[PDB]
Amino acid sequence: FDVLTFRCESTYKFKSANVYSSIKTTGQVLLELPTKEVIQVGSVDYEAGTSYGNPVTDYLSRNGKTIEESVIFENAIPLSSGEEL
Amino acid sequence: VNGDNVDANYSKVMVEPRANMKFDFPTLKSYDEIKQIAPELEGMLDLE
């Protein structure tokens, strides 16, 4: 292990405005394989109760952002701006 | 998980100490114990 790229999925249950009655997480596990030849992987599991956040998702985010094929360009210029839009 | 509102109660609030300036006249011992410090010297000096 040196890095993750989990494709996960969770399930929240609210008991109030922000606090969650329960948490359910099952997700999937990811990491690089041998000579760029990747095959099947496994998954995860989690439950909770009366929680103010999800450990799994917050952990994955806190270590870093997702597979982000979107880095914003430095400065803005117009594209088709004017009255012809 | 537990949020920032519950973990704050885990720590106790201490007492912020301050001065207790008294005047503290010399501590008068009891008569029974001060008759032990000095033997029967009672009524023998002129207090004046």
Curated annotation (Swiss-Prot), chain A:
UniProt name for this protein: Fatty acid synthase subunit beta
Membrane-spanning parts: none
Family, per entry: Belongs to the fungal fatty acid synthetase subunit beta family.
S-S bridge residues: none
Top-level taxon of origin: Eukaryota
Job description of the protein: Fatty acid synthetase catalyzes the formation of long-chain fatty acids from acetyl-CoA, malonyl-CoA and NADPH. The beta subunit contains domains for: [acyl-carrier-protein] acetyltransferase and malonyltransferase, S-acyl fatty acid synthase thioesterase, enoyl-[acyl-carrier-protein] reductase, and 3-hydroxypalmitoyl-[acyl-carrier-protein] dehydratase.
Assembly with partners or alone: [Alpha(6)beta(6)] hexamers of two multifunctional subunits (alpha and beta).
Swiss-Prot record, chain B:
Protein name: Fatty acid synthase subunit alpha
Domain of life: Eukaryota
Job of this protein: Fatty acid synthetase catalyzes the formation of long-chain fatty acids from acetyl-CoA, malonyl-CoA and NADPH. The alpha subunit contains domains for: acyl carrier protein, 3-oxoacyl-[acyl-carrier-protein] reductase, and 3-oxoacyl-[acyl-carrier-protein] synthase.
Organism ancestry: Eukaryota, Fungi, Dikarya, Ascomycota, Saccharomycotina
Residues of the full protein shown: 968 to 1015 of 1885
The family this protein is said to belong to: Belongs to the thiolase-like superfamily. Fungal fatty acid synthetase subunit alpha family.
Subunit structure: [Alpha(6)beta(6)] hexamers of two multifunctional subunits (alpha and beta).
